[PDB]
Design an enzyme around this catalytic site. Structure first.
Site, PDB file in Angstrom:
ATOM      1  N   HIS A 125      -8.755   9.570   7.846  1.00  0.00           N
ATOM      2  CA  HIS A 125      -9.201   8.748   9.080  1.00  0.00           C
ATOM      3  C   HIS A 125     -10.421   9.081   9.864  1.00  0.00           C
ATOM      4  O   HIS A 125     -10.394  10.296   9.928  1.00  0.00           O
ATOM      5  CB  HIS A 125      -7.983   8.641   9.935  1.00  0.00           C
ATOM      6  CG  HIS A 125      -8.232   7.697  11.214  1.00  0.00           C
ATOM      7  ND1 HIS A 125      -8.192   6.434  11.341  1.00  0.00           N
ATOM      8  CD2 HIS A 125      -8.682   8.238  12.333  1.00  0.00           C
ATOM      9  CE1 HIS A 125      -8.593   5.838  12.606  1.00  0.00           C
ATOM     10  NE2 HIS A 125      -8.713   7.123  13.151  1.00  0.00           N
ATOM     11  N   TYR A 135     -16.640   5.622   9.593  1.00  0.00           N
ATOM     12  CA  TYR A 135     -16.117   5.121  10.860  1.00  0.00           C
ATOM     13  C   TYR A 135     -15.741   6.394  11.780  1.00  0.00           C
ATOM     14  O   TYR A 135     -14.632   6.792  12.118  1.00  0.00           O
ATOM     15  CB  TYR A 135     -14.926   4.542  10.577  1.00  0.00           C
ATOM     16  CG  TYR A 135     -14.855   3.320   9.504  1.00  0.00           C
ATOM     17  CD1 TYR A 135     -15.089   3.506   8.101  1.00  0.00           C
ATOM     18  CD2 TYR A 135     -15.137   2.018   9.933  1.00  0.00           C
ATOM     19  CE1 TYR A 135     -15.247   2.395   7.411  1.00  0.00           C
ATOM     20  CE2 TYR A 135     -15.084   1.051   9.231  1.00  0.00           C
ATOM     21  CZ  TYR A 135     -15.288   1.230   7.955  1.00  0.00           C
ATOM     22  OH  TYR A 135     -15.168   0.126   7.059  1.00  0.00           O
ATOM     23  N   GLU A 142      -8.057   0.625   1.376  1.00  0.00           N
ATOM     24  CA  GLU A 142      -7.766   0.721   2.798  1.00  0.00           C
ATOM     25  C   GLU A 142      -6.306   0.525   3.103  1.00  0.00           C
ATOM     26  O   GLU A 142      -5.638  -0.047   2.453  1.00  0.00           O
ATOM     27  CB  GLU A 142      -8.679  -0.521   3.458  1.00  0.00           C
ATOM     28  CG  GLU A 142      -8.556  -0.367   4.975  1.00  0.00           C
ATOM     29  CD  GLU A 142      -9.504  -1.433   5.782  1.00  0.00           C
ATOM     30  OE1 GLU A 142      -9.157  -2.565   5.733  1.00  0.00           O
ATOM     31  OE2 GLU A 142     -10.502  -0.695   6.227  1.00  0.00           O
TER      32      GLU A 142
END
Lengths: 499, 499
Positions: free
Chosen positions: A17, A49, A132
């Site tokens: 993550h 991200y 994902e």
């Protein structure tokens, strides 16, 4: 809706993550709370991200953590990402939200295969082999969280830490940006003090002048600057390719000067937004023809330094310390972005369904299967190639096909090319070089509003497989217009032998 | 393998067959005998396969006949054209040839639905709505044959008769080539005698000279010739568009002169083969930007005449009566070919899966369904757009989307753009004009070896259908680089509202 063959049960299932600046420590205390919690199997995509939302372009990157489910987790691979479609074909309630339902006990008993929870899986993105994971927030509380990397901690400039990490994926452009930053700074300084250069600056209008005269002057600056000993490798490696010519450095600088005002120059995010939409950055990056040519720290520093000095000169003529500060910082980030794309596995022009763009034409395999020539059987196969051009009518002279007597012959009756639906048959002949040339029986032109489908049909009389030794080339060659040595515009579609 | 829904039984089933010169009368006596007999439902496509095989390019066209089966004929629509695949899924013998089997009684009893024979049907070609019929030779003997048209009989020049017929399909470029031929001849003559023109000829090196000097001279010829009263409309309609400039006529002529030797000039087929592979014919045709601008007999004749005179001049300078004879005859055929393509229904750039090619970029809907925005329901849809560029890295600034509050909003969480697999999220905002602008959160560049997929996701909260009145535009606008009035390179993907 669900790909059983790609679904499975795993003990101690983990994923990654990406984590924003400010959250790298707090997240490791647990997963709390945006209608779903997202993770991926690839820690390098996770790194993506991890950039500050207020400043997505050039902001600080936080880090990456690893999250693990205790006991057994059922990974459920999905065929579609449509919530409604999913709840329908599974026989689930079409009322309550899908992800909420996924965390319920009735759902887990039915799809879990004995697992303590289900996690839904989807292809990460087109062009990626990553996946994902979509996680229910409640179930997410069970996750233990461990640090993978914290980019902040590394104490490096800009987004160097994040990109240096990503470049580990390919073991490959793997530059030391610290060295590049230091050398760039050094050269810009040494360049400012150089007599011949100081001289040329003194010949500058130093006032808002015509764009054409500004470019004219900048080209001369470039020429004189390039003669400096600390730019000697750059002089050599840029001497031959038109993309890397002085004219293109000058065009870049004038462009930068025209889009950067006071408030823009004062903010790194605003500067990156503005630089990021300009054409012609490949000239500075040393990027052309599918290759990154400037791929040593020494040469990248020289090009950035030269660019910086020229932008400095352009601002007075068509537009501050911007040139040596925000501009350098910003352009370094753009380099990293592009270098990263080139480090990523991807299909070159004319491979799979990626078009081959050349001389005003565009051609591509219609689908991926078309680009595969299956072997080890007896019979026919068909292969469709889309063809058009950008504007005025341009001709298609024919096509060069690889042939192997018996193992791969052209089916001369089924091969044809259709132009706006007009079906045109072809004349095919073996020529020097283990190649069959087919020409249309009526003239073919494509252009804006006129497109063709070239349909190649192959015949196999032997069940024997094609050895990678018996084919001379890995491409079908479509021939465009002819231009005292005659030559055809060459449009290549690359294939793979399988089965 | 077989599309039942598209299959049927018909009494007095007819179709059309293109017929070579020499065979138009004998065929009407019956259908004899190349492993199968081919016909089509479209008499205009039939007209296509009516040209002499020895001279496919510029040869004479025979005609079209209509063939009819007595009693009931079963038309069997096929999903695949693979012989082997067919005999397999139908449970037919995998030994005997498929078409032979099709004529057998056991086959007809099983698939005929009571018909006296089966005829197999296949889509004519990609980009065509026509069908092709495959007929068993034996069964073909039952066909009665009637004349539809005989092009020879019409007693016209070149392939005028065949093309004049085809142009009837669109009730549309429908030119009288007789008039064009006559006017072209007239003008070339009048141009040769004109004093100012005779003069410029006398200033010609009239010997093998440098290509650059030849072009330079030809441009002057063009300029002076264009001042002739019989070319006045041409002077006007070519004065503004760069494609139609003197430089381009001159480039064409020099090119013609360089590819035409003695033996070539002496044969119409050889001349057409050679002219057909040259670039730049759009300048002479008046064809640019998806449109045929020269679409009156008067203006086509003027352009052909001017071209002819210039080719005449080029031959001495970089290379006979070729210019007024075979060259005119040949180029007229090429005009007809291209005009025909433009008369045929086809998808413009950025419609369906046809790419939009602009400023070095290429973009297209991934599949046809992507280009459809379905309406009249509540929920999500996704739409993939492929994006790349030809060479150096060029940026993608963002995308403009049509939005209708409630009936068509952007799903801001599912919308994204993936660059070589790197998934990039976007920031979306409503701007002036009933349009939502999305920008990537990381810089996007495409180029040779770097491609993106832009994934647009839409959300519908109302079941009410979109009235064609509430949408301002029929296109999604992808924005490329920026170039004192700032403007983005505009890349358009056109959609249709359905359901």
């Amino acid at each position: 809706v669900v790909d059983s063959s790609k679904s499975f049960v795993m003990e101690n299932f983990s994923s990654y993550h990406g984590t924003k600046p400010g959250y790298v420590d707090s997240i490791q205390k647990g997963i709390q709370k945006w209608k779903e919690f997202y993770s991926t199997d690839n820690k390098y995509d996770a790194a993506g991200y991890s950039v500050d939302n207020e400043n997505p372009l050039s902001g600080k990157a936080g880090g990456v953590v690893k999250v693990t489910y205790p006991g057994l987790t059922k990974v459920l691979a999905l065929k579609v990402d449509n919530a409604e479609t999913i709840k329908k074909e599974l026989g689930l309630s079409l009322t309550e939200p899908l992800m909420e339902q996924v965390g319920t006990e009735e759902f887990i008993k039915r799809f879990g295969d004995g697992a303590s929870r289900v996690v839904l899986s989807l292809p990460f993105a087109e062009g990626s082999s990553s996946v994902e994971y979509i996680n229910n927030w409640e179930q997410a509380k069970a996750l233990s969280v461990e640090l993978e990397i914290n980019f902040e901690t590394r104490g490096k400039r800009g987004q160097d830490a994040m990109y240096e990490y990503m470049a580990q994926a390919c073991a490959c452009i793997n530059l030391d940006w610290d060295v590049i930053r230091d050398k760039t700074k050094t050269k810009i300084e040494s360049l400012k003090e150089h007599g011949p250069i100081k001289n040329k600056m003194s010949e500058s209008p130093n006032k808002t002048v015509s764009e054409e005269k500004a470019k004219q002057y900048l080209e001369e600056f470039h020429q004189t600057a390039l003669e400096h000993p600390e730019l000697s490798e750059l002089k050599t490696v840029t001497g031959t390719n038109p993309v890397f010519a002085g004219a293109n450095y000058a065009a870049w600088a004038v462009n930068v000067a025209q889009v950067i005002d006071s408030e823009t120059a004062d903010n790194l995010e605003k500067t990156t937004a503005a630089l990021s939409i300009l054409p012609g950055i490949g000239s500075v990056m040393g990027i052309a023809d599918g290759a990154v040519h400037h791929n040593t720290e020494e040469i990248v520093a020289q090009s950035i330094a030269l660019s910086s000095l020229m932008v400095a000169q352009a601002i007075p003529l068509v537009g501050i310390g911007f040139a040596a500060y925000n501009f350098v910082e910003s352009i370094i980030n753009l380099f990293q972005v592009v270098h990263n794309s080139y480090n990523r596995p991807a299909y070159s022009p004319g491979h799979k369904t990626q078009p081959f763009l050349h001389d005003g034409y565009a051609v591509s395999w219609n689908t991926v299967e078309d680009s595969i020539i299956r072997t080890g059987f007896q019979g026919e196969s068909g292969h469709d190639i889309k063809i058009t051009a950008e504007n005025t009518p341009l001709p298609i002279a024919g096509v060069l096909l690889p042939t192997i007597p018996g193992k791969l012959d052209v089916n001369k009756s089924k091969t044809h090319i259709s132009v706006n639906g007009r079906k045109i048959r072809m004349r095919c002949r073996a020529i020097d070089g283990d190649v069959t040339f087919c020409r249309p029986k009526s003239p073919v032109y494509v252009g804006n509003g006129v497109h063709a489908n070239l349909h190649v049909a192959f015949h196999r009389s032997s069940s024997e497989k094609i050895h990678s030794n018996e084919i001379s080339s890995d491409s079908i060659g479509v021939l465009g217009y002819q231009k005292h040595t005659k030559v055809n515009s060459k449009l290549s579609l690359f294939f793979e032998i399988k089965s």
